Structure 1
Amino acid sequence: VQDLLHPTAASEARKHKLKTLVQGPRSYFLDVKCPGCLNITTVFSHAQTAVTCESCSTILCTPTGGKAKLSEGTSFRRK
């Protein structure tokens, strides 16, 4: 037995994004630090574009089927 008004956090975490009590995105944004210039760039987790660092024009992420794959050597933090 479960309470629909107050679902368990793990239960909601298992469900699809649109099937929760109040639908919301499971994506997030990241601060990616370019290996060269050490500046921070905001990158979408599921980015569909090869985000490039504006100063150095270096590839920070590459698109894939779902989450974008971050370039090797790029440090990241969740924002």
Structure 2
Amino acid sequence: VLVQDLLHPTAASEARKHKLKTLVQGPRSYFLDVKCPGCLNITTVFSHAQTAVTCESCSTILCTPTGGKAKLSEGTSFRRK
């Protein structure tokens, strides 16, 4: 189109665009509080966590790193921050 509002694009279009190609670039990742059954241990875990994050309580590897987002364990509950 010849005429369009680049200063005020649609939310759907900006969500569709690459993270660095938006107007003001922002991270598509997020932080989440993961609690494991048993020990409450509300602990903030990065969505792309590159590590076997474990709380100090016991054998509680929370997330296993993947190519992109960190995959969480089987018994675990996460809340987006």
For residues 30 and 24 of structure 1, the distance between their equivalents in structure 2, rounded to whole angstroms, comes to 17
Q: Per-residue displacement from partner, 1:25-60 (whole Å, max 9, x unpaired)? A: 000000000112122111000100110011224110
| Mapping for residues 35-50 of structure 1, pairs under 5 Å | 35-50=37-52
Over alpha carbons, which structure has the higher Rg? Answer: 2
Distance in 1 (CA, whole Å) between partners of 2:55 and 2:46 is 14
Q: Runs ≥4 in structure 1, deviation > 6 angstroms?
A: none
Contact 1:34 1:53 in 2 (8 A): no
Conserved? CA contact 1:34–1:75, under 8 Å: yes
State the alpha-carbon separation in 2 of the partners of residues 30 and 56 from structure 1.
20
Following superposition of structure 1 onto structure 2, how do residues 8-47 of structure 1 map, counting pairs within 5 Å?
Answer: 8-47=10-49
CA positional deviation for 1:9: 0.3
* Structure 2 gap segments, 5+ residues each: none
Partner-residue secondary structure (3-state), 1:35: coil
Q: Percent identity?
A: 100
Offset of residue 5 of structure 1: 0.6
Q: Unaligned regions of 5+ residues in structure 1, if any?
A: none
Pairwise CA distance, 1:2: 2.8
Q: CA RMSD in A?
A: 1.0
TM-score (norm 1): 0.94
